[PDB]
Each structure stands twice: as C-alpha cells, then as structure tokens.
Amino acid sequence: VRKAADGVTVVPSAKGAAPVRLQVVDAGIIRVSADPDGDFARSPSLMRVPVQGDTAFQVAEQGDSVQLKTGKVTASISTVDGHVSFADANGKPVLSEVAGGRSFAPLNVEGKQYLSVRQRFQSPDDEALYGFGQHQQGWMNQKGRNVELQQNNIDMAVPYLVSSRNYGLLWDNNSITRLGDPRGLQPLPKTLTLYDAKGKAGALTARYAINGKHILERRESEVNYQYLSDLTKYPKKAITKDKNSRMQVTWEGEIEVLTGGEHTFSLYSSEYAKLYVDGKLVVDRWRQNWNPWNHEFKLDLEPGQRHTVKVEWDLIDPSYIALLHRDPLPAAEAKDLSLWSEAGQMIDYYFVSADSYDQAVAGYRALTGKSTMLPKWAYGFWQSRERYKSQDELVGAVAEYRKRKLSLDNIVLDWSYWPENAWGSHDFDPQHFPDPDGMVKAVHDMHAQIMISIWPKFYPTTANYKELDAAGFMFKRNVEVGELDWIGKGYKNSFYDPYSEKAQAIYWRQINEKLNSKGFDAWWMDADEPDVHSNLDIAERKARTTPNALGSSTEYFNSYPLPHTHGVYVGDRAADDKRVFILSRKGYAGTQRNAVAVWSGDIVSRWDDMRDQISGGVNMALSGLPNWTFDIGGFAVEKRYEDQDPAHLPEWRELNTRWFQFGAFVPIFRSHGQFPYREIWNIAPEGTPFYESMAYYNRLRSALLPYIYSLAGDTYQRDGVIMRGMMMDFPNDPKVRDINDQYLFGPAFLVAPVTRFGATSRQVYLPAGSSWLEFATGKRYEGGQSIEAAAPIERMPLFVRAGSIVPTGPVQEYVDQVADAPLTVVVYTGADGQFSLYEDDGKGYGYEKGEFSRIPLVWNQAKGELSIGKREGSWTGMQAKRTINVRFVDGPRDDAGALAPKTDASIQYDGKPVSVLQR
C-alpha cells in the first residue's frame, strides 16, 4: 500500500488483478485508475482541466481493505482484487465496482498496442441513469439500455453519466465507448437461426423491385446494406438512377433464438422502412437517404419457437439499411452498469458525489471546465435557411421580420457562398454575394447579428488546403482515393487535423483574414464529427482521419470537435473583446469551456423525431452541455413536403407550428431546414392559426428574456443547466423518471410539447409535492396526477410551479430595443419561492472580473409578501434606478399568458431592499 500526497495505490494480491490508484481531486471527487502495468501512464487527457480543491484525506487499513476518507466520501479498496466501493459522509453505500469486474484486452492497430478496457459496477433494479450524450432512441432513462458513443451527424458522444443514487461518473476515454453490452450490434445470423419464406433454414427471402415492378428474388443470410462498402452487393439489375424512380426491397422469413431472455435489435435505415414481427408493426420510419440511423426495439424470445419477420424498404439511390441484433448477456453480468472503450492505456474514471442532480452536473464542470457565457443576443430568436442563395435573400429575410414587427436577433448564412470549386478559400461568389462587407453592415444596421458556416473541409486546389497540407495538417487519404463530394460534377476534398496548436493557428488565421475582418458575429462550425464522406464504414472514417498530431483516430475517435472549436474560440477572443459564439454540430466532454453551443443535427420533419428531441435535450443537459438546440420543424423533408403537395400542407403547417412552440422553450431558439422556407410567414400566411401561434411564441420569448438570461448567467456562476429533466427538481417522484415527452425550462416552466397530428389535447403528468398553474388560464392543479391538458393547435401545454418568481420584460423586436425597459416580476403563488436575478452587460467578458449584478427576489406565501433584496454588484450600463412592476397569479385570471399583462403594483428600485404586498 503506497501513500501519496493526494491518494494511495494498492497492488492487489490476487493473480491477474490490476494495480489500482485513487486520487482525491476534491472532497467529493475521486479519481480511479486501474492499469495492469502498475505505472498509470496514459495519453494526456483532453477533457480534463486543472482543479484546485480540498485534497485532504485519512487512510485506514482493515483486513481485506484500504479506506480513504474525506469530508464527503469514504472509498474502500480491496487488497485482494482492488475493486473499489464508495460510501457517503454518513457511511451509506453509494456505488461499488464488481469484484473482479475489470477487463483489459489487447488491440494492435496503427503501429501501437492499446487496451480495450471494461469496468463493471453493481447496479440495483431501481437505479435510474441519465446523460452519456444526446441520442435518438427517445429514451429518457438509460437504465438497462445499450448506448454506443460514436460521433455521428445526429448522435453525440459525451462520456459523463448521472445516477438517481446520488453520484456522477466521468469516463476519461476518447475512443468509441459502450454503455451496457460491450460487444455492440451483431449481424443477424450470429446468434439467431433464420428460415426463409418457404421454411428453408439459413436465410430470409429478399425481393427487389424498381417502381413497383419486381426484378429478382434471392436468399440472404444477413440484412446488410449499412455502409458504402456494403452497397457493392446490391443486385446491379435492380438499381435505377432515374431522377424520379424509386426502388423497393422486402425481406421475409422467420427467426429463432439460441438463448432465452430479452433480445435487442436495431433497424438501421434511411428512406422508408417498416418492420413487422409476428405480424405486429415494430418500426415504421423515414429518414433522408444519406442519413440513416439506428431504430432500436426489443423482444422477449425463447428458443424452440419461430417468429415471423417482414421488412419493407422503399428507397432511392443510394440508401442504407441493416437489421442487427444483440443476444442476452450472461446472467452474472446482465444487470451490471458496464462501461467499455475500444482503445486506451488503462481504466480511468472519476467518481462525483452528488446530493442533487445539480451537484452532479457541477462536478462535471469542475472536471472539464466552466461553461463560457454566451452573448445575450444568442438567447433571442435565430432565423436560418438551407440555404440563402444570395445576400439579397438573406438581407431580405431580416427586413421582412422587421417589416412585420416580429422578434428577430440573429440571421444565418449556410454553406456554398464560395465559388463552387473553392470550398475552404472562404471567398464569396460575386454572382450571388457581390458585397459581403455590405451584407454584414446591412444586417448590423437592422440591429441583428449574422453567423456564417465554416467547415473543417478543404478542396486540394485552394491556397488554404496547400498551406495546411504543406505543414502536415491535412488528412491525406480521402484525396488519395479520389472520393468526390456531392457538389456539381463532384470535387475531391479532405478535412484538416485540428489536434496541434500549429494547425489551429493556421485554420483560424485563414478565417480571421477572410471572414472575421468583415464583421461576422458568430461561427457555425459544422460537420465536425468529422463527416469526411457520409456513410463510409467505420474503418474508412478512421483511415481518412489518421494519423493526427497526437496519435490515431482509433484512440481519439470522439474528440475531434474539442480542439477544433478551441482554436476558433482562442483566435476570436484574441481578436477583440466581444464574447464568442460557436454553434458546433458535435459537442464533447469539455466543449462548454470554448463558448460552444450544439444542435442535434440533420434530423427529419417527422413527429417521432420531434418527440425524440425532448429526451435528447434532457440527457444533453445532464451530460453537462447547457447550450443546445435543434432545427425547428426538422432538417430534411419528404417529397410530399418538398414539392408542396397541397394534400399535405395542413400536416406540414401543424408539425412546424408544434415544433416552433417547443423550440421557443429550449436553451437556444432557432429555425432552420431545407426547402420549404422556414420563416414564419413562409410556413403559413397571416390569418391562419399557425401564424398566430408562431407570432405569439416568437414574442413571448422576448418577454421572458430576463428569466432566460438569468439562467444563462448561472450556467457559469452556479455551474447550472437551462433545460431541466423533471427528475432534477422531483428526485423522489418515481413517475417522472421515465417520461420522455415532458421537461422543465428553468425551475418555473413545465413544458409538454404536442407530438401528434390532429391532437387538440394531451396527457400531462404533474409531479407530486407542488401545485401547478396553467400558464394560459391560471387554473390551479394539484401535483401528483395526470390530466388531459388542453392544447389547441395554437397553444402548447405549459404549467408553472407554485412559488415561481419569473422576471419578465416588454415584448422586444430585438435585445435591448427599448432602453431602460421596466422589469415585470410575475409571482405564481401557492408556496414559498425565491429567484436571484442575474444581470450583466451581455457583451464582454467583464463578468469574469465580477462585473455582474444579482437582485434577490423572495416570495413568502403566508405573508403574501414579495421581498426585493439589496442589489450586489455593478456593470457597464446597469440601471442604478429602475421601474419594477409586480404581477400576482394565484388562480384563474382573464389575461393569463398575455404578452402585455396587467400589473398589480409598481415601485421604483435603487438597490435598497423594498417590499411589495399582495393584499
């Protein structure tokens, strides 16, 4: 037993048990490293930042154990096999590794020897787990689920996990990583017996057609057109590339399992895909052809009995599909919490003791960095398009929002503003963008900010490619094989290597000269998975992104966006004193410290996709990234929407309206997508209920800005989140652990988006222990019940927790439009409450030096008294003296939810404590 200033190392006595080392990072944060070699040498962590905490501890030796005790945690290490167990300050057990539960296996790749590592933990049936990124299965609770971390367009990896048992876990590994089954999805015949449509064993029956005309039939032992390399087996006779011809494939047969229990499956698919098991529809999905993804299901199956399978695929060239399977784990490990990683040097993780879900997130921010404050205008409405094709189109959109007096802060310029053959030059095509400097000035003159797309992608004919390539920072393989992108005739292209500080310097310098010099406000840092060529198999994605400056893409598969965004953050911040804003398609552990917001990628205009974002956003927040958004309405659309078929116009309008209501209540409020156009008046004309609704929520957002921005300030000040899972504030209510279509927008607003076409109401579960006020009526509902909440097309169910204090302002066409606006404090009565209102200049980094104010608001229910406490702090432009209106909502009120509601009292405030009585 070896003692150190910050922990101990134990070499266990059992043969094969790896040495283990514990380090105290803080009283409630313990690092655990296990390494067969006993050296604990690893590649320098990319996610970690330094922590200066209380590293005091005391050691005791029992018979089979060494125990480390801080003020918050007791960690016990077995001297026999090294397995670690955690208990809290009162000795109550919290988390224990499985004894003998470590695995290390050699992986010899790219000239190195790595270990694939696996750690198993004991996990009770009633433990709930959240986080591990942002995913697309619609699962809120992750307990018992298999989740693979592999950066993809719509699937985001962040290796931080939070548990209902009052802890969090940071898994410091940058390779492909698996929660649950460490083996990943198997080909169909691996642990299943197949029978075709005529009962013959060994395969299913595959039938291929073109435009409803059968081409051929054959037996197939797998359903696998998953990646580009798999497409070479598609029957050449059955392929049509005609502009408006479609293809169809069916698979039909039976399956039988070899081991009984819970079997999980994934139908990976693009375009239209259905799957029937025993004649019951199990998957019914559409995605755009170039972005397939996993659609998982599960079945309880036992050997000896057959079950029918029928797959129906309706596609265009090219599309992708695969039916994959996992058989049950052995009983001894099937219930464990298991973390696996493809490539590393050792097992290395951090245990975070958390009295609340909030404290769990705070430990992630301690370990990987505080969440940089974003500009205040970033929390207003964003309008985007794929794509504005000229500067007249982009400027025209801002001007039309101004003409209609709709609220708009930010406008976005998508890809392809450059000359076609010059991706990566950051030049503008003069045909469509003849005066980029004048474009930016025209937007600024209308009191709006403009963000521009910048990829990690370069064409080999550009000066910028050759500068990066000559310095060694261009990945070479995609150009060596001559892979052509999708633009016009097709262009060779590659992506740069961001891991070296020298590469980041070149990348930013090019952007600074060409774009930052013209006044652009924000950077849309797209495709940083990186998406070198969509739908390559994983071996090719790795081979076309390796070697990097630190090692292989196998060791660093998920970490690309972290150094990529870091370089732009550092460069932009050194260029002037304004706060940076970045929208990155991928986040990762630590990306919040580089002023990076993220979004869920190229999801589709489908009701299922909309509902899936609710649980995606909650788990994103609990993974530790607080600034998150999506494309309102979805990104890619079916032909019935693209062609604007009048028969589907009502559903198109209802979907985008429901999704717009939802987007107004997520951290960043943003409209984007492919044709049709997505601006409010282009969704539906004025006079329709869709326009009325979108206009209402567009303006309501601006009135709620004091509330929203106060939460933004506390993402930094209190290491907090904005989008809150219902279990964060109601951790003792079991009914909120698994609900996947409700959440809290800050502490006050319970949000229940409507995700069914033609619904005029929906079930909403109200958490127990508080009463709730319907935002649109003031009707009071007691907690702990499900209700049929009214939801006409124009309004989304929204409820306010009793005791909520919500600072609001007047409707604004843009941030700070009305100077010295009055503040309206709205109290939703029914219980005690408090809200410390955060304010600052919203523009620079003065908050880092304490340039911010906090005004305490305290509501006492018994006395009916709102106490406005003494102001603390000051900043450039603060209102020393200001008008504060107060509004009390204690039940049904005629103007409930009005954009400009009646106020019940008004005082002048100068920073000294003042009291307002309801009476």
Ligand SMILES: O[C@@H]1[C@@H](O)[C@@H](O)OC[C@H]1O
């Ligand atoms: O949001 C889109 C992004 O995900 C990618 O596909 O490039 C174009 C953008 O419009």
Ligand SMILES: [K+]
């Ligand atoms: K700056």
